Write a protein that binds this DNA or RNA. Structure first.
Ligand SMILES: [Cl-]
Ligand SMILES: [Cl-]
Ligand SMILES: [Mn+2]
Ligand SMILES: [Mn+2]
Ligand SMILES: [Mn+2]
Ligand SMILES: [Mn+2]
Ligand code: NA
Length: 325
DNA sequence: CGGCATACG
DNA sequence: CGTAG
DNA sequence: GCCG
């Protein structure tokens, strides 16, 4: 088992679901306390289990697996022995974990804001609504639409949104394309949002495109909230005799950068962090969603496809459905 | 022990 | 500070 | 929390 998640296929569904979910609780809780190092280890350990070809049934099978030390192995051991890990359950029912989870899940609220609110004694969404003066417009939108935003987005929703986004993109710039990215491109059947990447085959023509797209969507009455090259919106999506709010991300990239932006926005989050860590520490190259930089020769790699980027990095190609780290 | 990805709004 | 993957 |  390779040590980096970008070195191994990770499918969406796998054979160690309960074990990975428990480790991801501890990863999430570490993040709520500001321990990014422990978050990463628990995240990576969970991902290793997702990449295994069969269920872990005995502690023996953890020997030699990367990112499994005393702590993560003890968690697995207790789940194998008793069906439950005391530490995980303690986190699950803790007021701290439940409130930080509820607060951080609000669009516009991060760990730092949630932690300050928790220390001030706030615990519920209605606690936040009673004092709008402290909220940002982004937070007021996140709380107003929180219920809809907690409802899964389905594939049917995605196809309708894509058609509507394409319509506005086509008027903003004939020839521009819209590509579905994010978790749906990795094969997920549901999601908490929809991600689109927009480009144009003639380098430079995409300049200034996103404001034109947004104004067109705004004039169609489809934008419940919006704030450039990245736009984090809340869309009004038709429903049976009504509608629901849906988070939509729109991103523009010139065609020269499109493979890097496609790679980055297709995820997963852990996959991209591991890919960038691998790039820098193993290959000495600096990777982001704009390009891949050789800091010795001071040159950018030209890529025409995601396949090109994997080749540049000496990695076997992984389709999006195997990037579910 | 130091590192832990790297951007934009 | 928030956002993204 | 784990790796190198
Ligand atoms: Cl840490
Ligand atoms: Cl970037
Ligand atoms: Mn026991
Ligand atoms: Mn997404
Ligand atoms: Mn840019
Ligand atoms: Mn998104
Ligand atoms: Na949030």
């Amino acid at each position: 088992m390779p040590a980096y998640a970008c070195q191994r296929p990770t499918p969406l569904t796998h054979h160690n679901t309960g074990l990975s979910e428990a480790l991801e609780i501890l990863a999430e809780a570490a993040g709520f306390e500001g321990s990014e190092g422990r978050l990463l280890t628990f995240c990576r350990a969970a991902s290793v289990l997702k990449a295994l070809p069969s269920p872990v049934t005995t502690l023996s099978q953890l020997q030699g697996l990367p990112h499994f030390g005393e702590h993560s192995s003890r968690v697995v051991q207790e789940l194998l022995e008793h069906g439950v890990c005391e530490e995980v359950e303690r986190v699950r029912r803790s007021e701290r974990y439940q409130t930080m989870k509820l607060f951080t899940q609000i669009f516009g609220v991060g760990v730092k804001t949630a932690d300050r609110w928790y220390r001030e004694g706030l615990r519920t969404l209605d606690d936040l609504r009673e004092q709008p003066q402290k909220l940002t417009q982004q937070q007021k939108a996140g709380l107003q639409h929180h219920q809809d935003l907690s409802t899964p987005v389905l594939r049917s929703d995605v196809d309708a949104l894509q058609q509507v986004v394409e319509e506005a993109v086509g008027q903003a710039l004939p020839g521009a394309t819209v590509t579905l990215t994010g978790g749906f491109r990795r094969g997920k059947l549901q999601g908490h949002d929809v991600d689109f990447l927009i480009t144009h085959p003639k380098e430079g023509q995409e300049a200034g495109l996103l404001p034109r797209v947004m104004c067109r969507l705004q004039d169609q009455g489809l934008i419940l909230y919006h704030q450039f090259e990245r736009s984090f919106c809340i869309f009004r999506l038709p429903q049976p005799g009504s509608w629901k709010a849906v988070r939509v991300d729109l991103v523009v990239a010139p065609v020269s950068q499109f493979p890097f932006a496609l790679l980055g926005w297709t995820g997963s989050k852990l996959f991209q962090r591991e890919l960038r860590r691998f790039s820098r520490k193993e290959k000495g190259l600096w990777l982001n969603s704009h390009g891949l930089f050789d800091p010795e020769q001071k040159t950018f790699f030209q890529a025409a496809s995601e396949e090109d980027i994997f080749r540049h990095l000496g990695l076997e190609y992984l389709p999006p459905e195997q990037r579910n780290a």
